[PDB]
Amino acid sequence: GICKSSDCIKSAARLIQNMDATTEPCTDFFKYACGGWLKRNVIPETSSRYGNFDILRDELEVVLKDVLQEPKTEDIVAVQKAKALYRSCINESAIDSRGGEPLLKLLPDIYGWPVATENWEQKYGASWTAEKAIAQLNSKYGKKVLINLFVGTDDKNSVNHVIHIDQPRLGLPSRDYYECTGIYKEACTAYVDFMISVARLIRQEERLPIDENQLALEMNKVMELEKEIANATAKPEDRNDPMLLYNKMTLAQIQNNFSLEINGKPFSWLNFTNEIMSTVNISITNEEDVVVYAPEYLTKLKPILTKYSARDLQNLMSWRFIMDLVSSLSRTYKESRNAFRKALYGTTSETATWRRCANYVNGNMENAVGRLYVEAAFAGESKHVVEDLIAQIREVFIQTLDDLTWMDAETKKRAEEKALAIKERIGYPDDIVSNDNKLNNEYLELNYKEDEYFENIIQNLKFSQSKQLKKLREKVDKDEWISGAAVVNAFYSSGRNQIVFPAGILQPPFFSAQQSNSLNYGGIGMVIGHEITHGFDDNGRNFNKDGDLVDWWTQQSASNFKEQSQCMVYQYGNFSWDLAGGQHLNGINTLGENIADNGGLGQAYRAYQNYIKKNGEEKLLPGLDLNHKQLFFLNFAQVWCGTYRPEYAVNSIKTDVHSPGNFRIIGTLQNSAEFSEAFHCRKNSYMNPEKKCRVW
Numbered sequence: 001g002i003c004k005s006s007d008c009i010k011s012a013a014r015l016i017q018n019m020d021a022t023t024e025p026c027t028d029f030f031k032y033a034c035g036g037w038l039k040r041n042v043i044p045e046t047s048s049r050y051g052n053f054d055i056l057r058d059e060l061e062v063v064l065k066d067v068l069q070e071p072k073t074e075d076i077v078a079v080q081k082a083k084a085l086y087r088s089c090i091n092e093s094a095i096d097s098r099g100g101e102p103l104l105k106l107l108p109d110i111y112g113w114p115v116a117t118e119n120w121e122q123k124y125g126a127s128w129t130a131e132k133a134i135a136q137l138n139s140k141y142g143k144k145v146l147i148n149l150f151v152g153t154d155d156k157n158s159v160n161h162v163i164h165i166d167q168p169r170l171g172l173p174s175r176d177y178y179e180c181t182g183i184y185k186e187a188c189t190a191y192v193d194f195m196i197s198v199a200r201l202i203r204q205e206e207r208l209p210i211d212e213n214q215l216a217l218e219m220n221k222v223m224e225l226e227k228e229i230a231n232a233t234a235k236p237e238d239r240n241d242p243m244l245l246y247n248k249m250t251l252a253q254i255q256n257n258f259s260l261e262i263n264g265k266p267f268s269w270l271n272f273t274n275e276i277m278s279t280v281n282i283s284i285t286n287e288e289d290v291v292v293y294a295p296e297y298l299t300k301l302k303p304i305l306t307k308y309s310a311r312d313l314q315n316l317m318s319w320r321f322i323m324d325l326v327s328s329l330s331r332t333y334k335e336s337r338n339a340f341r342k343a344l345y346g347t348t349s350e351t352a353t354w355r356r357c358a359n360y361v362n363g364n365m366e367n368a369v370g371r372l373y374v375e376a377a378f379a380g381e382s383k384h385v386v387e388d389l390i391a392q393i394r395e396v397f398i399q400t401l402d403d404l405t406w407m408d409a410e411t412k413k414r415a416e417e418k419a420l421a422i423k424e425r426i427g428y429p430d431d432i433v434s435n436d437n438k439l440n441n442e443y444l445e446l447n448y449k450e451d452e453y454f455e456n457i458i459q460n461l462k463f464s465q466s467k468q469l470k471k472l473r474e475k476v477d478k479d480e481w482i483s484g485a486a487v488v489n490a491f492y493s494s495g496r497n498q499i500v501f502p503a504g505i506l507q508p509p510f511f512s513a514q515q516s517n518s519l520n521y522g523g524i525g526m527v528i529g530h531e532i533t534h535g536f537d538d539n540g541r542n543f544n545k546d547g548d549l550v551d552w553w554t555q556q557s558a559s560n561f562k563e564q565s566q567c568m569v570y571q572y573g574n575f576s577w578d579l580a581g582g583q584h585l586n587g588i589n590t591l592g593e594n595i596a597d598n599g600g601l602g603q604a605y606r607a608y609q610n611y612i613k614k615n616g617e618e619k620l621l622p623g624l625d626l627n628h629k630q631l632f633f634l635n636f637a638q639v640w641c642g643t644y645r646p647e648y649a650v651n652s653i654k655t656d657v658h659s660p661g662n663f664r665i666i667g668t669l670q671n672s673a674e675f676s677e678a679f680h681c682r683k684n685s686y687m688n689p690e691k692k693c694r695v696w
């Protein structure tokens, strides 16, 4: 009783070609499940990571290029904009002819780039101050330097917005890089050379005189500034407790508890905060409430700042925006990035311009692009089947609450509470197809010119930032999706207490109404449990049914969670990762994702078990000597057939909240008794340790 459908033939062939049945599943299940993929595939030059998951994202791009590249008479305005933005984006000759000019037009208006100016002090240092300068970059261009102010949702009341202050992101991927030795040396060297190179082009294009030594002089000074700011930022592992993280102040407290002396002042938080909010005609009292994520960093900032010029400061501040612009300029500007992105990413070339451009438009017009994607590529009934799967898996989670010995009764009850309260977002929002007005109106204020890509993307930064800040006194809309449809991913929002599964992830190998349920439950089913479980991981457990940051745990149950979850900190902490040169994974920074994998997979199996009990076994797949319990786990693993470039592995072992795909397979299956029953694994086989972690 082999299935011999078209769709069964496709499924089986993919499973076969990926796997290496030469390998004992119980010795190394990633090798087993993925061995044939590993043999046949080399990472593309434009890829920092490649794998089945990334391939889906490459395939989604092909769809986007098809729906963006050809004007259609009936196209509503919203989509004409997307396509026009697309067209402005793929015209390189237009862009190459403008050189850097579009940036030079731009410089004066963020207070300059001193290293690339004459008499910066005469021109600006007058007008200059750090209030005014940090605030420009932030409110006009959304670039967050020195101090990150951001209108956001309020962790303690999910219907409101607040102003946040947090530590900024850095020009290198993580604070660790600023060690600048060993595995980090090239990066630091490439980074400053890239500074240097960009500032030389501008001086040249300005026809200014070029003194290499002073360039190095000033760009090294920028680096040692950023080094200090790096050392002053808190680690991820010390940022992971949302109750620790949430400290609400008035500007008043802030001004009196977190003083800064920049240049010679010192710093007017009130002034700073109004230069930003001013940008949207809103008024801020020194009595305004602010959520402060990074108190210690602010503290630490004081002595640092007092030590550098306005020139030094602005040289870092402007470069952190310029950084991001130069690949939207001509080829010579493009080129100066070459060695820096190689150092961070290991890639030797830019991705295709049409793909970059397809993704950028998706980024900036996600509902419009998403309408098109769904029309071309998304069936419409996938989404009913997924709705029902989500009901199944949510029920299973609830069930398991009874068999979990490390919570107390009341705590279980609240856990069921919060779970009943999860609200699910599947595929796309019908609005974006049925309601033309609403889609046109989201982009009303935008007007693109097909020969001015750089103007266009400037405008999108302004619009974006205008939008966000004006939410301050507005409620949160509970209609709002937190992802477009044309995205290969899924999401949990603890503020919305909501799970989202875009059209883009609802395809093989994760999902098809035509593929075997075993494949479904091991793919998208595992994914739905992942997302649910995040509501109850080491961040999400802190948020309640309404998305509010408030404790609903007993001290005992909370402490047991920490204890149970500690097992995963150690297990994963202990993997060493060849591609990153033998470093251990960070067990703390991945914990949330690892909890979500182990809970999510177990949930999904039990939901497959529950399915088979009710509907009976499935017909087997042709060409494969495996039953469906076995297939369930095959497919789980094959989602993550993939590899990394060493450079990116070094980047990602610090920056990714996920474990690398291979250790996710191995991580979770070692903790799963079901798996080892599937493949008759000996006690103490590599895949089957006697000691096993469990939380959800």
Ligand SMILES: SC[C@@H](Cc1ccccc1)c1nc2c[nH+]ccc2[nH]1
Pocket (backbone or CB within 6 Å): 489, 490, 491, 526, 527, 530, 639, 658
């Ligand atoms: S946090 C959502 C999760 C969704 C997911 C869970 C389980 C299996 C596949 C995807 C996920 N998205 C990713 C994006 N990049 C790398 C790893 C990722 N993991």
Ligand SMILES: *[C@@H]1O[C@H](CO)[C@@H](O)[C@H](O)[C@H]1NC(C)=O
Pocket (backbone or CB within 6 Å): 091, 093, 094, 451
């Ligand atoms: C590229 O942009 C320039 C604008 O100067 C235009 O003349 C040229 O025809 C454009 N090419 C395409 C294919 O649209």
Ligand SMILES: *[C@@H]1O[C@H](CO)[C@@H](O)[C@H](O)[C@H]1NC(C)=O
Pocket (backbone or CB within 6 Å): 129, 131, 268, 270, 271, 272, 274, 275, 278
């Ligand atoms: C902020 O303070 C500066 C100091 O020069 C002042 O010029 C500016 O008008 C002030 N703006 C706001 C929003 O208070």
Ligand SMILES: *[C@@H]1O[C@H](CO)[C@@H](O)[C@H](O)[C@H]1NC(C)=O
Pocket (backbone or CB within 6 Å): 569, 570, 571, 573, 574, 584, 587
């Ligand atoms: C490996 O597990 C052991 C035993 O708990 C633990 O002491 C050690 O810290 C773990 N390794 C890492 C790097 O976390």
Ligand SMILES: [Zn+2]
Pocket (backbone or CB within 6 Å): 530, 534, 593, 596
């Ligand atoms: Zn996740």
